[PDB]
Amino acid sequence: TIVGVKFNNGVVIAADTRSTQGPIVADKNCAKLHRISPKIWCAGAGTAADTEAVTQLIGSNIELHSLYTSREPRVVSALQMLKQHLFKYQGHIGAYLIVAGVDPTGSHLFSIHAHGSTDVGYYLSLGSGSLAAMAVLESHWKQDLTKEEAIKLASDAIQAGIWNDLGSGSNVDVCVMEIGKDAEYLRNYLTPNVREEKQKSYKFPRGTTAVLKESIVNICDIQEE
Amino acid sequence: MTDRYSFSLTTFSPSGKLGQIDYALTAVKQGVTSLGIKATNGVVIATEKKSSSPLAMSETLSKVSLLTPDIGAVYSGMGPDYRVLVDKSRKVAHTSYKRIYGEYPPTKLLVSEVAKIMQEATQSGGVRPFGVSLLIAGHDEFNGFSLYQVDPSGSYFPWKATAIGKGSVAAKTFLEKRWNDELELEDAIHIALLTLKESVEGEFNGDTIELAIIGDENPDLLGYTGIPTDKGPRFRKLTSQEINDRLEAL
Amino acid sequence: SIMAVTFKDGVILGADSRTTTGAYIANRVTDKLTRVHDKIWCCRSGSAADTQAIADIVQYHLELYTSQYGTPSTETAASVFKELCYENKDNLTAGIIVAGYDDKNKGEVYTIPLGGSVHKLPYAIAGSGSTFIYGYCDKNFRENMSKEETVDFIKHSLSQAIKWDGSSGGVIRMVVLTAAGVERLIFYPDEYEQL
Amino acid sequence: XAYX
Amino acid sequence: XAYX
Amino acid sequence: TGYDLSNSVFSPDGRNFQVEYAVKAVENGTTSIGIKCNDGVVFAVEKLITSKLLVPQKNVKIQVVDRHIGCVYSGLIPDGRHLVNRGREEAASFKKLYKTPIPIPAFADRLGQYVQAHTLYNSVRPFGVSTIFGGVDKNGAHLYMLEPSGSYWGYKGAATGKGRQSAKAELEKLVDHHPEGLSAREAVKQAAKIIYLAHEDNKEKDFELEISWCSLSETNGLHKFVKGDLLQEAIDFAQKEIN
Amino acid sequence: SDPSSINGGIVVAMTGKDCVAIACDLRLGSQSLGVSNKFEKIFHYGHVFLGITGLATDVTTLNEMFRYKTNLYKLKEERAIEPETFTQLVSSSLYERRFGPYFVGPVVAGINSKSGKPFIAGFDLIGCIDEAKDFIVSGTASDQLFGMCESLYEPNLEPEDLFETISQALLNAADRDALSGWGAVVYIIKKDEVVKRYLKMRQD
Amino acid sequence: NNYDGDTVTFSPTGRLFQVEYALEAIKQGSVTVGLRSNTHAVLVALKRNADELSSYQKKIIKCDEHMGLSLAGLAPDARVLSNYLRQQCNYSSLVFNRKLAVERAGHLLCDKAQKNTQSYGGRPYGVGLLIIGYDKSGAHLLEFQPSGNVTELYGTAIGARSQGAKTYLERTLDTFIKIDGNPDELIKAGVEAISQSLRDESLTVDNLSIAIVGKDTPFTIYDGEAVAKYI
Amino acid sequence: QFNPYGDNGGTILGIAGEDFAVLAGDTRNITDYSINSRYEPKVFDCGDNIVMSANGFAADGDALVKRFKNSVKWYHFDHNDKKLSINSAARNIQHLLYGKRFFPYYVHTII
Amino acid sequence: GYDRHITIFSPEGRLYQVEYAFKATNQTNINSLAVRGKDCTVVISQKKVPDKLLDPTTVSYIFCISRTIGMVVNGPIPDARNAALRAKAEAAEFRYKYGYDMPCDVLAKRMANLSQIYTQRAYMRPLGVILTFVSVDEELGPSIYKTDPAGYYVGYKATATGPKQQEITTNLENHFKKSKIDHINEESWEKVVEFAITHMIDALGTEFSKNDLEVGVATKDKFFTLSAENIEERLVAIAEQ
Amino acid sequence: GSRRYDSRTTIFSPEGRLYQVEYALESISHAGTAIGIMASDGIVLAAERKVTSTLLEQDTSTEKLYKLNDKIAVAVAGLTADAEILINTARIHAQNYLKTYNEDIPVEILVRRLSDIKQGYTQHGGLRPFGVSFIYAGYDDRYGYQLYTSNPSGNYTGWKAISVGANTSAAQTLLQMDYKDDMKVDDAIELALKTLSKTTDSSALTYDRLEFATIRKGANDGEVYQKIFKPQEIKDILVKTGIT
Ligand SMILES: [Cl-]
Ligand SMILES: [Mg+2]
Ligand SMILES: [Mg+2]
């Protein structure tokens, strides 16, 4: 579950912290909020490697472009470069990204699908929990949201996904990008799914496991003398 | 058409000299003075903003360039050759390192990559050497602070302090007397400003001097908060005002 | 549901605002009317990715045309669209209506179906919802209509297309192309549904 | 996927 | 593979 | 010295001597002219009759590009043919993509950029022709003249080759005596006269007159050769004016 | 037919108090037939340990490839590669074969020589990074290992305790997988000493 | 002088010396005559031997059923250019079911020769060609120079002492043009023309080479006792 | 999908005498149950006293006959107008046909 | 002495082919001037039609690169048009790839990087032109950036190019020394063009008719050139005060 | 065309010498002297830095001695930049061999490859040769301790003791005089430094003007250690041998 919400003086994006391999939870606390540029962040759904890889590549090319032009990077640049890359690979790079940020032009919120289609919105949701999240956004969104209202709405839309979607789970990650301010990255903004104490300690008595052989491993280099 | 210059334009003369590299170094000699000084807790690089016309806006021309958040570069010789080297240096820092290891290259390896680009212009077909000497100041976790010179040949040497271009011979003598291994960064800046005044003719102020440091991490210049391990760039370009402040205590 | 209609003073482009991924509405306020030049616009139907990719290239080609040879004709714009659509017909799912205002040629509409064929027409309809209004549009279209008449014709036409087609819905967007300039109109459900 |  |  | 041995080498002056030498080949060629009339353009050329064995009206020098552009040149005839072949490729690719026939100013720059490209490298030789070309587009009539350097401008009248000074003087009179403009049929007659007058610089060998024109009213904006009665009417007018 | 379950095998890594542990089985098979019980899946480049499960040809190929890359790294950098950096190198190397991948499940384990912080990470076959605090699992009995680790593990275990936990996690997971077992090795890694133990386990 | 090193260099008077040197190879070549009426076009070629043991170098090459040329200069260059014409004549037939016009054949040779005069590394062609043919607009004779210049003529001659034959044809123009539906008399006029370029040596049976193409006559070459009729 | 082959039917017959040979073929060209032409020749004079017919897919047959006819033309050019013997023609046609071994000419050839 | 024929170093560390390219720059004998207003950037250039047979409308050294960027060239027209077409192509490609209009100073840098290559690669010659790029940039505001055959570029408060550049330069220098600001403090572009023309007249000591000048104006979101009649209105205003 | 400006870097003189190779060797003769000495129980590499400054950071400096793998090192004489191009090639070839055969590359095979690359630049491509001479100090389990040299010609030869760069004539005479076959590493260290001390164009031989390296079986049991001497270690071995 990844959401983006526009507010009065900027944009906020949120995500859950679950990665899955089939029905198994591979990572209980995983970072889906990617820095393309200091004030351009995007949330990723789809193939986990593809979302990281495509944001790092464009993030790198955006940094070189920023140095070349002597200008802070723009969201439309990251957006154009992402969509042209994803379109080239005809959806075979399974990256579904919500791209947000502030630049000299103002605050921007875009979604980009794996086939290279882009759209504009005041509120967007992507991933398996998009329908749970969109339900909350469609119910509670209004024009002229404050920062505090936009964070609340964003994290509420992720929670909807966490609870009602088997694909989404664990914690809520938020990033706030306000005009004329440093983007604040709130890692584990909420922790609604903390595991309860176990009934028993499974710490074994020493010498429980049967050992065939023992040896020192040499990790050091070839020695002197 | 086609580039039919597939042969070396730089060859050995009977004396064993590589003419075009020597002539490139002669071009560097004519160039405006730049210098670098290494302190215990930072590195300073400085040069004169020799404005071509007073109508020209000298701020728009950057002689001191950021290569990575922790590595800066200054030159003496042909400006255009420097500009395209900075572009190539910034890119190779990404393609040959950051896109592989997920971190910025250490100073000595980025220098090594720049050096390689300049050696190739010394041997490849249908090209002349670059007409610049670079001073590259940088920090990295395992080597700490470092300062390197790179010549048109592709040869590079690490320096405690040095100078290149117009008044290098005089400047290097001045630095040898003033440099010690116990210098703080503010001391090195003071020495850098003293050294550079000797090689400047006309106005000497924040508007005619370009000076940058590799020092402490600047979290205020990072552009975002929320990741403890990201503390911001060690490269900072000093403002016009910040230079003038240190010229009153000169 | 997309259409372009020629009238006395120029041309009007109309579209719905619904983007679907299967039976889910991905975007309910989509802008399916895209600028390729000041007074040359297009309506996009088929793959969202393919039509954007094409529209982005055409805008590039006409910007470069303008730099060298000045304002391109609507016919020229249509030709660049056709060239991309015809030559890449095996890899593209794009149905594009091209509409533009010259001072010499006035209002012109070109439709480009899947094949990549070009057809110059007084008015054109396309998209999934177009099938339901072939009868209506044919009976109700006249040449040299007024602006108000042409806005009504498009509003009523797309109103029906939206009503019967599940893939069509949301707001009706229109773009008026005349000597006067470029006007953007929007009509909300509460207005067009009760027609 | 997205596809009037 | 891994796949919100 | 040695600055004139290689193409694309700047002399200490800032000159490309190889291009200036190409101009000498052009100056050596037969006279060719262009006249811009009310609603079109007229092209004429001097064809030296080396021998009686030359078949009259067969060795055609004026070349069409697309269907609306006429091209004539003085200097190395093969170099002219090579430039027109490129012109035809450029006009074809333009019509293929943009549908409309290539505008004359657009076509002028296509040749311009190509000819200029042959002054950028020592691996190629500059063009040994000055090319007078033009026709009718949507914006009306256009006449152009293109030099070995890649330099071209629009012209009211144009002339190149051995009789250019003589031709230029006669063109300058027409511009002064017709400010309101010249008709297509008048321009054909005047073209004939100017070639006959310019033939005094090639007076040793007798010559053959060849005229073409694009007029919105007289040819429907298509390039056509002047033939039969209209050609004989222009020769008669020209012969009457020299006597 | 499925490349990642022809040869079989498992790797598991755990963090303790100022230590990490990585362990693997020793089986290599052609589906049902067991071929070798000497096929170790844990390799080390300096103080950074890499376990690899999956298609055995790719296990061997990647080992040879990372030895190559870490050797050149050391020559140019004039220092041993650290776990965090090596993790990024594995990811890079796997994703450059995105549309023709190595059929492997790599696991990085080691202690950062400067900070002294215990570090483990896992990867998918196209190089997506799983950087867990607690434990990483990989191989044909990943489900079994997830179950064992998720109940047995507690944070800040001493080296000799951590040994018992990771050992029991591997051994009991391997016995519920046909294509895993035939012996097991456990590396106990501290800042400047590494002990390697072979475990007695049922050979079927 | 300094400007004759390669074909990419103009002289200060706007001359291409490498092209002019290629033009010199032709003048060294053995004489060949071309002439036509309205019905037929004839090539007459004086073949040159190395010595009395040697054969007489073939001068006339067939390009199609309706077209061929005679050569003077480097024979290998004539082979390259004739092979190109054969292909262009062949392409016209296969693709358009159309016999290539002689005028267009000229235009194609011109454009091929030109590319070798404007590019570094290459060299001009060292041969001159006389192309005869019968197409939809009747009989044709072309003269090709390796400068690229191609000229349609009633008659001409190229090679050593060619000026003698050219002067004769210039006098006979009004006579031989009228020789319609009489191939033997047109050849006679061709043999009498080339005879004005001979010195010491005369036309023998293995020395003379004649070719003809016309209304109902495919391009055919006559050598040996087939030309004894015309000696 | 797109099928690059078709059947135009017809039948050809070659009989060799002592001092003569005949190559016969019907003049009917068909597609499915439709008659395309009642007189469309399928036996051709190729020069040098060689007659050829490639019967099956008419398009592939027309293409092969063209290529062989062209092959005869270039034999004359490259070998001083030598007459192409039937055994030589036969070997030349084998190389034409095998050229398209993995995208065949769907024709039965008799010369 | 082949070190003077191609772009390799002389023993003095010089590139003679670059120096000789600079000399080609003045071959046209035309003087250009560029100044900045509050809301606009104005560029004026001398127009000389020596031949009566020339169509004067087609004689121009000012080019509309993009909707926002204008370019005046000092040098021969073939190299000028070579540079124009390339800049047009680069500006279009930039918009397609990065999704915003190429800034004036970024195009200047790009054309300067291309110019630098010709000074380092032997098979390519330098273009004998100085390119003056003008726009009202959406970030930097009124902008003047100038490129030369060496591959050098810089921003300008104002600038002048051609045979009599030094006379125009000092005239502008002296004005900005009085006003003590980096621009012309004027609301309308009409009056900024009047300033540009007036200060060229004073610097060159020549009077101008409507056909003697060529004017380009950059405002927010468009660059355009003035007609003969638009200049005539400008000349009438100057004379009437 | 472009032929006018071609130096033709790969042609024979009338005497049958390669101009560019000969002129490259002339270049190398001005470079700082490098010495290799091979003993029964190890190899020594000594090299002189060219007129240094007091403001050159020495502890982080490397111009002469480079590491190719754990078993093989090179001393450089000529263009440092040219040497680094070849060194990275050699480092890759060594790792390619290790990847393929799962064994460290034999010294001669690595030397032959680098020497084959230099040869190529003298026979084709029309580029200038590499202005570099190498001394290769290596160990493998076939031939044990080995010294080789390569020069711009691409010729390579084996040595008991060898010099490259400046004053090789003088250096080779002194080595040929004092070298014996039964010699040990400690003795070979003393010889190397004594040789440089006498051939040097400098007033005196000091720690700040030297790079020094040993390859010893002086590693705990049956293995080989590479020691690139630190500035303070070079200063210590200069006092020990009694030169300072
Ligand atoms: Cl660039
Ligand atoms: Mg609906
Ligand atoms: Mg050059």
Side-chain angles (χ1 to χ4, degrees), chain H residues 3-177:
Chain H
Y3 311 89
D4 69 334
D6 43 47
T7 339
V8 80
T9 306
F10 274 110
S11 80
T13 57
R15 302 168 64 186
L16 301 172
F17 276 110
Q18 274 300 308
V19 174
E20 287 186 23
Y21 295 172
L23 254 52
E24 197 58 33
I26 302 166
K27 265 75 81 74
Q28 308 304 331
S30 188
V31 66
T32 179
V33 171
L35 82 165
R36 73 171 189 78
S37 68
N38 285 305
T39 59
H40 294 81
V42 172
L43 288 172
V44 186
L46 182 72
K47 301 185 289 182
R48 183 178 288 167
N49 69 327
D51 60 39
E52 271 53 63
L53 286 332
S54 100
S55 65
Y56 288 77
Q57 185 92 340
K58 75 157 200 286
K59 297 272 279 168
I60 301 170
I61 304 165
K62 181 182 176 183
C63 289
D64 210 347
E65 293 299 328
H66 73 95
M67 197 192 296
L69 61 282
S70 70
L71 69 98
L74 288 177
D77 284 18
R79 170 159 169 74
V80 167
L81 288 169
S82 70
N83 185 252
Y84 174 74
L85 252 185
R86 279 172 172 181
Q87 283 181 334
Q88 289 301 320
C89 279
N90 203 237
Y91 182 87
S92 190
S93 283
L94 292 166
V95 175
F96 294 101
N97 192 209
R98 181 180 198 174
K99 286 172 185 169
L100 183 64
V102 175
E103 195 185 329
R104 214 201 153 223
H107 294 320
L108 285 167
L109 279 172
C110 165
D111 294 351
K112 208 210 194 304
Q114 191 280 153
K115 292 197 177 192
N116 287 210
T117 69
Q118 200 168 194
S119 298
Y120 174 62
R123 68 167 175 83
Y125 290 96
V127 70
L129 307 167
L130 305 182
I131 305 100
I132 62 163
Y134 195 88
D135 60 29
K136 275 202 158 191
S137 62
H140 297 283
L141 167 67
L142 261 53
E143 184 187 321
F144 164 91
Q145 287 181 235
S147 56
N149 294 284
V150 181
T151 311
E152 184 156 327
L153 296 143
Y154 290 116
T156 186
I158 55 165
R161 282 155 266 175
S162 56
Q163 190 60 232
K166 203 169 187 185
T167 309
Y168 167 90
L169 290 164
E170 206 164 5
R171 296 186 80 265
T172 320
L173 173 56
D174 302 345
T175 308
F176 75 76
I177 193 63

Side-chain angles (χ1 to χ4, degrees), chain B residues 1-2 4-5, chain F residues 121-124:
Chain B
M1 187 230 289
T2 314
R4 309 209 68 172
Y5 292 77
Chain F
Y121 319 94
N122 61 200
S123 57
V124 293

Side-chain angles (χ1 to χ4, degrees), chain B residues 5 126, chain F residues 8 120, chain J residues 5-8 17-18 117-126:
Chain B
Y5 292 77
Chain F
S8 85
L120 286 178
Chain J
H5 288 198
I6 55 163
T7 55
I8 62 168
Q17 278 301 302
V18 176
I117 290 163
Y118 311 144
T119 79
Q120 188 154 203
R121 227 105 86 188
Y123 88 105
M124 290 250 52
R125 77 163 169 85

Side-chain angles (χ1 to χ4, degrees), chain A residues 68, chain B residues 87, chain J residues 109-110 113-114:
Chain A
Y68 187 100
Chain B
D87 291 318
Chain J
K109 188 189 174 175
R110 172 55 182 169
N113 278 163
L114 258 33

Side-chain angles (χ1 to χ4, degrees), chain K residues 29 66 72 132 146 173 178 186 218 230:
Chain K
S29 78
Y66 292 91
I72 305 169
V132 176
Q146 302 164 72
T173 306
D178 288 333
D186 290 15
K230 298 213 157 289

Side-chain angles (χ1 to χ4, degrees), chain B residues 149-169:
Chain B
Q149 185 185 335
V150 190
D151 279 355
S153 72
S155 304
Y156 61 92
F157 338 85
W159 291 97
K160 289 159 178 171
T162 190
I164 50 165
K166 216 180 187 76
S168 56
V169 174

